[PDB]
Amino acid sequence: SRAMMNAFKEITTMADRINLPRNIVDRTNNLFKQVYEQKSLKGRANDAIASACLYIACRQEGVPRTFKEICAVSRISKKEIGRCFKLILKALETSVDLITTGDFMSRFCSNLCLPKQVQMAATHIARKAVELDLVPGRSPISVAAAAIYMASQASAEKRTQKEIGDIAGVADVTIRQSYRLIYPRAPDLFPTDFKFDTPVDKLPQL
């Protein structure tokens, strides 16, 4: 083992700077522990595999609304990062994608000190996506919950997927499924009323 101790240190260094909870480190340690003992992956890119597990760890509880805010290390061997990511992503699922029916209220999703401004914006984003049927991998309901997250992101609101997965009781992985092929090249989910609070333009990865 060589990249094992190296990756762990790299992850801990980044997680500590971003002020991430143990939910990240503990998870990443458990994930890397298995991905490092892979036949195909003999530790090709330490930085890549480290970031891969890191992304999976903050997937639900840890992501600051966008992965861009923590893309400090995700600027090297990004190809291998996504490569190893898919391997572990299909290894353990929360299995929350079994409801997706009570999001029709939507109001309770903003109970976490979320202004109705995000609510109105989310419905507009969802409408454009649903009416276009950009993501037929689930249902029109899943797009609504996912739109709430997208609306929060574009409103500089750092929310996590945990809220929608557990508190909302919709489906955590459903957000990722909706936020998959919903964008052709850019977040063209804005009708007209969306003035776009965060003018970053290039907003890839949540």
């Binding site: 970031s51 291998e80 490569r83 990511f85 299909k90």
Partner: peptide, 26 residues
């Protein structure tokens, strides 16, 4: 077939920023 799925997220890690700067290459 499941193990065949690896590069599917590669485009969501590398291509995301690579193509994201394509339309903003100025």
């Amino acid at each position: 077939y499941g193990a065949l799925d690896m590069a599917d997220f590669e485009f969501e890690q590398m291509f995301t920023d690579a193509l994201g700067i394509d339309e903003y290459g100025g």
